[PDB]
Symmetry: D2
Subunit: 484 residues, 4 copies
């Protein structure tokens, strides 16, 4: 048996854009992401799959079923987001000097919030309140995230930017987005504080800037390849996090965190340990040192950035193998996320439907490194596998949950594990083919089915432990019967 | 939902030789099969794996744990056998003309049973009583089978026979074995009737004669290749069944059946339907027409054979594809049981760790054909898959259970489904590598673990139905992620 | 036995950029493609592999060895290009009598005086080196098809990074009529200089891939990688008129045959209800182009016109072929299906159970017969198979790939098609564009460390074919699908 | 370049039973093997495949075509056997001065008079046909190694079904000294008849496989398939004395070199603690046999003796080699491991990640060097590589298999070993015993419907090797492991 503390919670995470649509009446056409996946040129180029999110799992209409299943599964925590575009589908009056690089302060008060109130979509706010009330009535502890990638179209036209036209709404390249984000977050906290337990400002901001402006083959908006603009987007996102933090704290006393995409960086040979550290600096610490210690880049300390974080949401799937170079370090293909789909890595480890390598030890690595650097408590806010057949998921689930136990045992303050995800959903540029659910979705009927891994998770959650009977699943899925 | 009748029972089947040994004190060295798998020449030839049954799962010592798990799984029926060799390890006095071909009668009465009593091993009888009492106390309905392949060494020395020496104890080639089998079965019924619900005389007698004397590459005792001796063994086994039936009925009023190995015979092309019928005649009907209608081979009717059956135990794994020949019919490799391990058949269907093709429709075929010919009620007494990883079993389980539902819906009287098996066990000449358990066995510690399929079976059994939530598993395991 | 006419030639095709560099002093940094593959942002995005052409097979210095092996192998035809950038590495003077705002280029006047001026700007070392290569070529008895263009443009004509970034103020490649004007002049110039060595001309290699991958299929990492339906059409329009202007230019200086080389797939119906889908696909991917440069039929804005300056500008068709495309009828028209043709997994099997190559291309030789006979029946121009081959480092499938496709050409001739040679892609491994060196198409293996060439068993098979002018009885079993059971699925 | 001595020969080996039948009038129903493979019970048990040798490649009638192709391929040596059963299809008179109960056969007197008597019983059509085959062989410049025995015994000497059934009252094959006596006479007889055509002799092909698979490895479906450690030893004991008696018999009539051909694997240690395990394996599978027939050392019942009638009966060693065997130390001795060598899955990869053949045999060329040099250092007798090859219908791995093993022979010579030729198994596909026709080892493919031979690309590779007496620079990259990524795992 591997027993968790009595206060530890098991649950799940999901995103508005990936899961909301699918039931008639749920359509939200007003985001950069909506426009982006319907774009004819993006489709012809294969940058997006051609699948459309309005044919999704339909959480907007069917949330009661989702919560029903989650309760039967013994889950006690959930992390969701509100979609910005649903609440403010229409542009807000211009507020503020747009040419200033830094946004050190955004003044928000009772009067300003009441003014915003008059622009807000009331049907959308009331519907979210209905969803969250039903969530809370199942005994689910609620982490509310403000941002999980789609921006209102009135703040970002991604096709214009893709085309190299910077005269329109430019998303994270514009301090106007920073300013409005802080206000949105204060506003939502103001409206929903009575239901919320903890807050997250944003989900994986590193992926937004990284795939948006460098990893353009990913088909993420706006898909404009520029090292310079990628840095600008990340700089603005950092400030937006700090201002959203201050905004929420002006209205609520509850914990405010952030959710971030992590890999476990691993040395190719024992000569590559420095390369691991440089990779950790460049992919992780630089960002967290900014919003925790105020350290940013000349290398300065910004007092408006310092201390703006109460907890860390750890998202984790797999490792990245690095080696030392003359000029620095490189990542290696054939490991981590750079493998063949439904095959084996260069290390002989099985890969998912998405080509991601099975490497649960990485999670222990990531949890304990954060803990040793910052001493902030953590949730595992995302962890899971693309696996429609359910072959690897039982092993994936138990192995990762074990590593969390390992992390706690070593002293790290980790307070919950939230699987990605409760049900299948729309996997961004990849469409519906990448199925991460504990529950399978038949997209024709929106009916949910329990994969055997869901029954395994029920065992874990109901008992607050990896029980004796399922302990063998803390191992690598046998590769011999699997595709190579 | 697929709901079964309120009286339908879900459970499991297991064999004494495959599951009993493994705990110190359980060793039974006195069978043909024990001798056969320890034989140095058999080992060097690769006819047996080299694995030894005394290193098994240890049901003899650990039966309470097995039954505990079965109860938690919601099972309500079990079929086991007593091992003949445990009860009579030593030769019994010669009774009876050994050169007579037919055994039409074996006289058994109270006095003869008391005489046998004085030869019986009392420790073994008392231990079995303890096992079965504990079984019944979990609310398990009990089918007791008399014979599941091992014969006492004093009735069969398989190495002598393998060597072409017929002067020793010759197993099913000798009417002495028939005579003693009838007495053993009456004796066991006499001892255990208060605990037993239904009886089976024997398990898969067709496999005993077929692999014993024709399919000699299987490594079944005595491994002497002879069409003639295979017929002789089957003739004696048939008579032994009829005499065991009469023996049990002299002592008990309870239902007496038999458990038999079935394939579903399928035509290669639509020109091969007659070939299917000939295959069914040669592999199935000839045997059942003997013990039900007394029809045997000149083609006669034996009154001592007629009507000796109350129910049919249907064992089923996969299909056999046949085609018409000039001289008759042939079976095709690349389908059914003749496939590559962990691969796909010639029809693109996934195969097991044993190379057996996924074909659940065959079970409906087999159930309804028996029903339409004889109108005897049936149990599915064996059905399962060699699958250590648990990749295919959830699908295999739900799909086959569905076909049973299909059979009932069409009118067939089927009263239970017994999965092969509750836990991993010693798979004959193949050893421990073929793992059929709903529970995984760690052979070092004898600890049992729940594979995700066990949690799926708990759903089925507790509800008496394939529930809505697991209904997607009534499909073929996706082949793309699997080895080809 | 499958015998070819006595005049039919077996050989190979090769491209300057893919094969020239690798030997000391061979480097040509002055193309869009060179800049494109060295670009740090393109590298970080994985648009390009990170392999660099300057570490290539070194034909620039080792051409005598290549030619030696090709002669040993009994080859009798070769098709090569001159790299524009090596001849004119620096810009030429903005031309007289030229309006950059005019959509159409109906004429480009080139005379002996203009040619003599151009000659002042040409790199003489490059010109002399190419003469040395081609002389050596002809000395082995190889018939020579000289192609003018095989993708890289001089940087002074195209800065692809600028265009990638959405900046159209600089040199914009096929988006500019200046490039059309200069291409015409370049082709006339090369013909004027090399006509004593050339047997037949091609203007261009696969223009449809340049426009298509450059401006629509941007995940392929082709320059300038700017996603735009509108700009893809403009590039294709300009490339069409460039072909016509180049044909006139070559004809002003030469009597020899002038063709074009084009990328083809065989369009195949998913079900028997999809035959119209195939015809629409053939219209959109093939006929529209050739009806323009043969029949002068084209669309400019919104109208279907005939341009007398485009009509009749083709003497022969270079058929490039690898695999099929499976199409199905839609409400809005037709779509291609993944899991067939070039959209399969690498080293696997297609949805039809046919083996795929290192590049994920489906084995489908019957498509070649389909393509050759369709071109024949529509236009009645003679053709060459100018590119056919497989990415196969291990040499598992190539022996089958080669014999089978060569059989399909024999079948095409038998049906009446005028097909005059077969040219394998390629003699030796080379630099496969954005994919780098890992895609190995050679009959000969290249060790990139030593630049040594090795005969794959397929090269020995090809020698049998070429020396005999036939698929001989002894190798005829190779006219079949590589067995799939021993291969990866 | 890897060059061989000017006297080294490249060729092939072939067996009568596997290759002769298939043409009208070639049938030879009079062997244990023939009866064994037609047996209904053996068929139903799947001990034999159900394929029949009379539908084979037809060397009996088509030998001129085989020889034609072998000469085209530049081969210069061949090793064939005569089938005993074709020469003596009927029993011979029970012999004078012979006690069937004696364990040892120390002498078999054969003189000219006895030979002339035997000649009265020999089938003359068979003898003349073999002369015609061998004359044609020699006329292509092939050096001829004639082997006396390659597994089938005349039925009058062995009824395998009777023995399978445990009935030892009939003709019992290698379990009877009568078979030893007759083999000696047969070999002297064949030498007496064919010595003008023969260059070197072998008595036997792989006697260890006959005894081993016949009496222990019974799942292999070899005759008589009677499982007995004791009878395997008796068969091997008799086969050893048969070899000695045959050597004396041949020497009574011929001056030429007389050797034996033997099945070898390379024993390899699982871990570095297993080197003694390897030596014990080499003792039990190899040295015990050769110490008997070279040094006269043997065990009879319970004692280690020297027999002067066994000592020195060998002039050369025929090395047969396919793959390795991995062994590990046990308390009781040593064991072989599955997942390496010949115990792998077909068309897959071994536990060491090395590719396996259609037969499930692991690619391990370094084992050949190990085997050749071990024999050399122990006995200092010259050797031939008499069997080496791969079951590979598609020809994917064979080009690598061939070049790599041929390299390992070059390495053996370089180290000092006297190795005088390499003979591929085999020229053409044939009947692979209990496996039937599906295991295809030919450099040439056989279509069993027409009996036509086809050159696999490996045959072209072999022609390069043989005509040059070298692995040439051009094919030297084949001295490597077939890439596993494109193959089935
Ligand atoms: C984390 O990863 C999952 C699986 O890829 C989804 O993309 C989420 O939105 C992301 F936050
Ligand atoms: C039925 O089959 C199973 C799986 O092979 C076991 O062998 C049983 O003993 C047999 F009855
Ligand atoms: C045709 O295809 C080959 C191999 O893909 C090369 O890319 C050539 O340049 C192209 F023209
Ligand atoms: C050596 O092996 C080959 C291929 O396995 C044939 O079986 C020969 O007869 C044998 F001697």
């Amino acid at each position: 048996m591997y027993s968790f503390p009595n206060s530890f919670r098991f649950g799940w995470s999901q995103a508005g854009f990936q899961s909301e649509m699918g039931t008639p009446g749920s359509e939200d056409p007003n985001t950069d992401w909506y426009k982006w996946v319907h774009d004819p040129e993006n489709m012809a180029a294969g940058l997006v799959s051609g699948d459309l999110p309005e044919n999704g799992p339909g959480y907007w209409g069917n949330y009661k079923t989702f919560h029903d299943n989650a309760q039967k599964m013994g889950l006690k925590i959930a992390r969701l987001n509100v979609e910005w575009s649903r609440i403010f589908p229409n542009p807000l009056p211009r507020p503020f000097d747009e040419s200033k690089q830094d946004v050190t302060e955004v003044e928000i008060n009772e009067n300003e919030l009441k003014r915003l109130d008059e622009y807000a979509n009331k049907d959308a706010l009331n519907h979210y309140r209905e969803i969250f009330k039903d969530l809370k009535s199942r005994g689910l502890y609620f982490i509310l995230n403000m941002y999980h990638w789609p921006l209102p179209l009135w703040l970002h036209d991604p096709i214009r930017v893709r085309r190299g036209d910077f005269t329109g709404p430019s998303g994270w390249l514009s301090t106007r987005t920073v300013y409005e984000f802080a206000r949105f977050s204060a506003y939502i906290a103001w409206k929903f504080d009575d239901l919320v337990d903890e807050y997250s400002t944003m989900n994986e901001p590193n992926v937004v800037g990284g795939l948006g402006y460098v990893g353009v083959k990913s088909g993420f908006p706006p898909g404009y390849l520029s090292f310079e603009l990628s840095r600008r987007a990340m700089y603005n996102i950092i400030q937006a996090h700090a201002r959203a933090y201050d905004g929420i704290k002006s209205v609520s006393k509850k914990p405010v965190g952030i959710i971030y995409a992590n890999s476990s960086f691993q040395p190719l040979t024992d000569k590559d340990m420095e390369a691991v550290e440089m990779a950790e600096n460049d992919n992780r610490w630089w960002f967290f040192d900014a919003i925790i210690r105020g350290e940013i880049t000349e290398k300065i300390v910004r007092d408006d950035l310092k201390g703006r974080l109460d907890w860390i949401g750890v998202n984790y799937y797999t490792r990245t193998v690095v080696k030392r170079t003359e000029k620095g370090y490189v990542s290696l293909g054939g490991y981590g996320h750079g493998c063949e789909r439904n095959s084996v890595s260069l290390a002989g480890l099985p890969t998912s439907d998405f080509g991601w390598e099975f490497f649960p030890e990485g999670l222990y690595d990531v949890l304990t490194k954060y803990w040793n650097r910052y001493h902030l408590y953590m949730y595992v806010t995302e962890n899971g596998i693309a696996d429609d057949a359910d072959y690897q998921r039982p092993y994936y689930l138990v192995s990762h949950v074990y590593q969390v136990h390992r992390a706690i045992n070593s002293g790290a303050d980790v307070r919950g594990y939230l699987h990605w995800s409760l049900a299948d959903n729309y996997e961004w540029a990849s469409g519906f083919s990448m199925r991460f659910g504990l529950l399978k979705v038949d997209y024709n009927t929106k009916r949910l089915y329990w994969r055997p891994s869901a029954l395994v998770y029920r065992e874990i959650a109901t008992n607050g432990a990896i029980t004796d009977e399922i302990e063998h699943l803390n191992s690598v899925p046998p590769v011999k019967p699997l595709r190579h």
